[PDB]
Design an enzyme around this catalytic site. Structure first.
Site, PDB file in Angstrom:
ATOM      1  N   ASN A 143       0.813  -1.219   0.000  1.00 20.12           N
ATOM      2  CA  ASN A 143       0.000   0.000   0.000  1.00 20.12           C
ATOM      3  C   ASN A 143       0.849   1.274   0.000  1.00 20.12           C
ATOM      4  O   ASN A 143       0.359   2.357   0.333  1.00 20.12           O
ATOM      5  CB  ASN A 143      -0.948  -0.003   1.204  1.00 20.12           C
ATOM      6  CG  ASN A 143      -1.982  -1.114   1.137  1.00 20.12           C
ATOM      7  OD1 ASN A 143      -2.384  -1.553   0.057  1.00 20.12           O
ATOM      8  ND2 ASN A 143      -2.423  -1.572   2.299  1.00 20.12           N
ATOM      9  N   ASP A 160      -5.113   2.598  -0.695  1.00 24.46           N
ATOM     10  CA  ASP A 160      -5.982   1.589  -0.072  1.00 24.46           C
ATOM     11  C   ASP A 160      -6.446   2.004   1.330  1.00 24.46           C
ATOM     12  O   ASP A 160      -5.698   1.884   2.305  1.00 24.46           O
ATOM     13  CB  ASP A 160      -5.279   0.223  -0.021  1.00 24.46           C
ATOM     14  CG  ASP A 160      -6.221  -0.918   0.304  1.00 24.46           C
ATOM     15  OD1 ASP A 160      -7.451  -0.710   0.364  1.00 24.46           O
ATOM     16  OD2 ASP A 160      -5.718  -2.042   0.492  1.00 24.46           O
TER      17      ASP A 160
END
Lengths: 276, 276
Positions: A143, A160
């Site tokens: 991420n 995310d």
């Protein structure tokens, strides 16, 4: 809240698939009105009342809401939101320079000055969120996306937020989410959560940045979680033979079972290892 | 242990995709030597030392080992095991009659005699496993497959053991796995586990068989888990207006926070509601 009840296909051209989340499918897309490229995140909706194939509607809104407030250079931007019977489609900023996990393997291990170049950016992004009482809860190399990978000290944006919550609470917040390798002991033990869990994740990321290895991973899922709740890790000379005591201390001040004795984000930015 | 280091494609023809597990991909396949149809389960292997895309090797063996011992009419059979760099391929029995979840929606609610026809088969299969000290840990409508769906009282086999462990222990066994809706409080709280968790799941399945609804599901994941640890459920007259006290009692003797006060599998088969 209400998203655009329209066909996403009318305004954006789909192609090349990028990520492949659990109920999330990411696809590289192209805006028709301008030609600009974006990243479209398809979120499947929890179907007939009682089901698990898909994310709950209330949980999808939470993510959108967070992306709306969010506004920081090291953090993703949400441009549009579409919806139909089956999916909600978040049109997001496109970060083409690949994940940090991908980048690592090819260098395999960074120098402390390099490691802190990446880290500073994270700590800035995480600082901004914690100011607004937002906990990402899913900070990990997958991420953390680079803008351009082929530049000396690459610049990152956080992505995310399907798992991020606002810790806007004289309340209680507990639940189990994230990737086992990076989750803090309170998530493993199902104990009260706060902003502190993200500081545990950064401790884990930092360990990975310097060593390349994940401090808590074992041969089974069971074991990975045992190590986390126990806080079973050591600075294995193999990797940490030539690591500074400051770098060690920084990580050691972040991997603390008790969330309260764990460092906060503003203390991490004032650390000698990070501070100019 | 050692699996067949060969191309699965040489001995089995692939086609029609069936299930879509997390790191597991199921495909309908056809044996070349005979023409018999089988179900091939592709398990992605945990890659370079520290990763999470894929199942750990040690965790894959565990599943194979369990399928090897396993031998019961209401339970899946493992025929072959292949392997290459990226995937381990379990050739499994093919159960074409669809999942129990699929079957339910089209009925949408069963009579107690019907419900117990399905339940008896489960309890037999779960009894066999518990005798050998094997806990499935993932008992749910998606892992309960019907042989033939278009017959009056359909016959079932249990599937998916990627999460099953042998509770062969004067040891401690804890970890977090399964689908939130069906997991017992000890899994939610990260407390010691045994065979008792499966008896909680059956209680949940039974609730779903009679009512159609899932007793613990809420609007968020957080809430689903709160309800489980709290044991917050009630026999909502809506569905349970005409449900017998025995059927209620059976479910009520299975959804007990304390795993020890919870019913065991042999007590479930001796219950008036299940017993002939």
């Amino acid at each position: 809240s209400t998203f655009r009840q329209e066909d996403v296909e009318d305004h954006y051209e789909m192609g090349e698939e990028l990520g492949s989340g659990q109920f999330a499918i990411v696809r590289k897309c192209r805006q028709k009105g301008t030609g600009k490229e974006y990243a479209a995140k398809f979120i499947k909706k929890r179907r007939l009342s009682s089901s698990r194939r898909g994310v709950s509607r209330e949980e999808i809104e939470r993510e959108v809401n967070i992306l709306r407030e969010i506004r920081h250079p090291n953090i993703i931007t949400l441009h549009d939101i579409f919806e139909n019977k089956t999916d909600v489609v978040l049109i997001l900023e496109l970060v083409s320079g690949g994940e940090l996990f991908d980048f690592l393997a090819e260098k395999e291990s960074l120098t402390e000055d390099e490691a802190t170049q990446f880290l500073k950016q994270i700590l800035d992004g995480v600082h901004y969120l914690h100011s607004k009482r937002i906990a990402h809860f899913d900070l990990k190399p997958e991420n953390i996306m680079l803008l351009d990978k082929n530049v000396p000290n690459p610049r990152i944006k956080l992505i995310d937020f399907g798992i991020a919550h606002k810790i806007e609470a004289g309340n209680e917040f507990k639940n189990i989410f994230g990737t086992p390798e990076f989750v803090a002991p309170e998530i493993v033990n199902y104990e009260p959560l706060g902003l502190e869990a993200d500081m545990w994740s950064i401790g884990v990321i930092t360990y990975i940045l310097l060593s390349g290895a994940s401090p808590f991973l074992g041969e089974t899922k069971q074991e990975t979680l045992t190590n986390i709740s126990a806080v079973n890790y050591d600075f294995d000379e193999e990797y940490f033979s030539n690591t500074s005591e400051l770098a060690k201390d920084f990580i050691r001040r972040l991997l603390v079972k008790d969330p309260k004795r764990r460092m906060t984000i503003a203390q991490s930015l004032e650390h000698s290892w990070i501070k100019a």
